[PDB]
Amino acid sequence: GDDRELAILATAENLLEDRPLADISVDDLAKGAGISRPTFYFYFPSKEAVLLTLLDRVVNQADMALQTLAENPADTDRENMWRTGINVFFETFGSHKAVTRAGQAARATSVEVAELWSTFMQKWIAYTAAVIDAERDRGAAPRTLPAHELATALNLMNERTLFASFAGEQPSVPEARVLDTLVHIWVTSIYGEN
Amino acid sequence: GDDRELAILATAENLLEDRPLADISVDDLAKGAGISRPTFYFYFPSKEAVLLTLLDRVVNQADMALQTLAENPADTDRENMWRTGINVFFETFGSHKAVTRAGQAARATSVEVAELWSTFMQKWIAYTAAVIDAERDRGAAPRTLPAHELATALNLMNERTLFASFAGEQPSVPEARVLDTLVHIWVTSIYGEN
Ligand SMILES: O=C(Cn1cc(CNS(=O)(=O)c2ccc(I)cc2)nn1)N1CCC(c2nc(-c3cccs3)no2)CC1
Ligand SMILES: O=C(Cn1cc(CNS(=O)(=O)c2ccc(I)cc2)nn1)N1CCC(c2nc(-c3cccs3)no2)CC1
């Protein structure tokens, strides 16, 4: 029963490796899950709804991993703090490229997908800004840009730059260079007096 | 004759202020241009092709304005140099929000639109990297990240962050704050030793 829902999700993730959601039919999904098409419709109203659930799982896995980090002491220098935090997103979405690619595309045609992404981006921006505020309050970071606006730009850079790297877009930073690139820009802009 | 092509382009830009390309018919475009539908088809094979031409015009206007700056002496401090350069993009695309918004959407469904955008992004990244290289060669900027990878991330941040601001996305930096935000991040990451 839940095996059937999970089988549908796994099929969808597999199939998305090789083709876009448009090129995947409910029949394909039902076939791979070892169920009929009307049984599929018991579990999901559409193939679009299966993508939403896949993306919700990955997004929540990233969010939970960040929350785990936030709850640690984790004694290391400031650069290494930002790196471990950005690395949560690099590894989580990097482990789920087909879902990442499919989810990004579906922001344009799905209000629930756009809303899911927006809700989590606002959360991650708020956490970034709160950590910046703490760094300022302890005297480690200078009071330059408004912390929330800084957080916003840096998070949007990550969104676009991680994605370009994972998709192999032209232009893109090689995936093997993107962590180091993002961390440099976060650290110099957060701690830089100029 | 060219008046007719330009009339079609102007109509399309006007209509895109209020609705997406999907919600605009060839009939609407022909109507606004004061021509018949088959006359329209003489000028453009599709409404999609009209968008491509609009975007090509804006993109080339940004590119030409940047080339003009590059060809100036323009005696000012380094922060102000980057600001005037980023400001080319802020003003050009900011003056053409409907075309910007429509073009961004069409990257997903149009290979010519994706290719146009990619070609210019590669150009602007290469120019950014060349200016960074010059700053390093004169001893003004430190030899930190590979200049082309740095340029790439900073340009992608601008692409996504300018666009979020112009679209009024949640999350976004207010349009009245985005220039200052981008310039801070470019200047600290280019000149920052850490
Ligand atoms: O990268 C992000 C947020 N983010 C995540 C993404 C995902 N990019 S992506 O994979 O290409 C993607 C794009 C679109 C879609 I739909 C799905 C995925 N873009 N931005 N961060 C970096 C680290 C920030 C942070 N770290 C920390 C700490 C580090 C160490 C201790 S606390 N505090 O805040 C939180 C948000
Ligand atoms: O911002 C960019 C490139 N860019 C432009 C954009 C457009 N963003 S946008 O408007 O939201 C948009 C997004 C998507 C689409 I389709 C159309 C528009 N994104 N990135 N720059 C900043 C300045 C860089 C530069 N300045 C300079 C100099 C400054 C002063 C002397 S030389 N040299 O390189 C060149 C590229």
CATH number at residue B72: 1.10.357.10
Of the candidates A61, A93, A101, A60, which has an alpha carbon nearest to the alpha carbon of residue A178? Answer: A93
Q: Are A12 and A47 in contact (CB under 8 A)?
A: yes
Burial of A154 (0-12, 13-18, 19+ CB in 10 A): buried
Chain A closest-CA separation from residue B69 CA (Å): 23
- Ligand having the closest approach to the CA of A107: 1
CA B48 to chain centre: 18
Of the candidates A12, A42, A13, A41, which has an alpha carbon nearest to the alpha carbon of residue A28? Answer: A12
Question: Reported resolution in A?
Answer: 1.9
Same structural domain, B163 and B93: yes
Q: Are B180 and A145 in contact (CB under 8 A)?
A: yes
Same structural domain, A123 and A66: yes
Same structural domain, A54 and A40: no
Asked if B150 and A121 come within 8 Å (Cβ–Cβ), the reply is no
Same structural domain, B142 and B127: yes
A153 touches chain B (CB under 8 A): yes
Q: CB under 8 Å, gap of 24 or more: what pairs does B175-181 form?
A: B175/B94, B177/A146, B177/A149, B178/A153, B178/B90, B179/B83, B179/B86, B179/B87, B179/B90, B180/A145, B181/A145, B181/A149, B181/A150, B181/A152, B181/A153
- AA identity, residue B183: V
- Pinpoint the alpha helices (H) of chain A: 2-18, 26-33, 37-43, 47-70, 78-94, 97-106, 111-137, 147-167, 175-191
Q: CB under 8 Å, gap of 24 or more: what pairs does A94-98 form?
A: A94/A162, A94/A166, A94/A175, A96/A13, A96/A58, A97/A166, A97/A167, A98/A13, A98/A16, A98/A17
The Cα B24–Cα A47 span in angstroms is 28
Phi and psi dihedrals of A73, rounded to 5? -55, -70
Q: Are A62 and A93 in contact (CB under 8 A)?
A: yes
- Domain count for chain A: 2
Same structural domain, B106 and B85: yes
Distance set, CA B79 to CA A18, A87, B86, B94 (Å): 45, 30, 11, 21
Q: Are B171 and A159 in contact (CB under 8 A)?
A: no
Same structural domain, A1 and A80: no
DSSP letter (8 states) at residue A34: T
Q: Which residue has the tokens 């929540």?
A: A60
Tokens of A115: 């809303």
Same structural domain, B32 and B74: no
Same structural domain, A172 and A103: yes
Distance set, CA A109 to CA A89, A101, A102, A113 (Å): 24, 14, 11, 8
Burial of B58 (0-12, 13-18, 19+ CB in 10 A): middle
The Cα A189–Cα B186 span in angstroms is 8
Of the candidates B165, B166, B153, B43, which has an alpha carbon nearest to the alpha carbon of residue B97? Answer: B166
Q: Are A67 and A102 in contact (CB under 8 A)?
A: no
E-strand ranges in B9-151 read none
Same structural domain, A58 and A108: yes
Show the domain range for A40: 1-46
Same structural domain, A33 and A69: no
Experimental method: X-ray
Q: Are A7 and A34 in contact (CB under 8 A)?
A: yes
Same structural domain, B93 and B76: yes
The pick from B13, B56, B66, B160 for probing ligand 2's pocket by mutation, whose C-beta has the most ligand atoms within 8 angstroms, reads B66
- AA identity, residue A154: L
Which residues make Cβ contacts (< 8 Å) with residue A118, sequence separation at least 6? B169, B170, B171
Same structural domain, B16 and B52: no
Chain B closest-CA separation from residue A4 CA (Å): 32
CATH of the domain at A31: 1.10.10.60
Tokens of A171: 């232009």
The Cα A158–Cα A166 span in angstroms is 12
Which secondary-structure segment (H or E) carries A138?
Answer: none
